[PDB]
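Let's do one together. I've listed all components of the complex below, 156 residues spread over two lines.
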Amino acid sequence: FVDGYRAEGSKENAKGPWQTWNANKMQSKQIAIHRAALTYGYSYARVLPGVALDGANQAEIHGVSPRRLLALYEDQIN
Amino acid sequence: FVDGYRAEGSKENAKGPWQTWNANKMQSKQIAIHRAALTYGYSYARVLPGVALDGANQAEIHGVSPRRLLALYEDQIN
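Okay, and this is what the predicted structure of the assembly comes out as:
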């Protein structure tokens, strides 16, 4: 389980990426992502631009199973 | 079991959704909802507008078993 985004030298989670994490309901999707990664071997997370509820910029993050994705790497190790 | 609705930065339950939770007698229906979710796999909760005892707005929340519901999703996940 992932809780908080502790930046270097700060004891409080930043109001940046953590806001996106909370808005995207990642607290319930991280379990599925970890389960897929442990089962298949390599999970995939899709992040795309989107509009927020108030009209601001909110990044939409979703997880895609390897059964429904085919990623090609020119350098698999890194 | 669910007790209280702790908002961020507040140690006391808000007088909003918690009032609806108490009015709808959810303390006795949450057990059935959880049992149906654990047995069938996916429970369903129906929330509809309604009038309160004093004439105000009270949200009527009810649980529907999968045996008596068929929900269609254009996207099953996320």
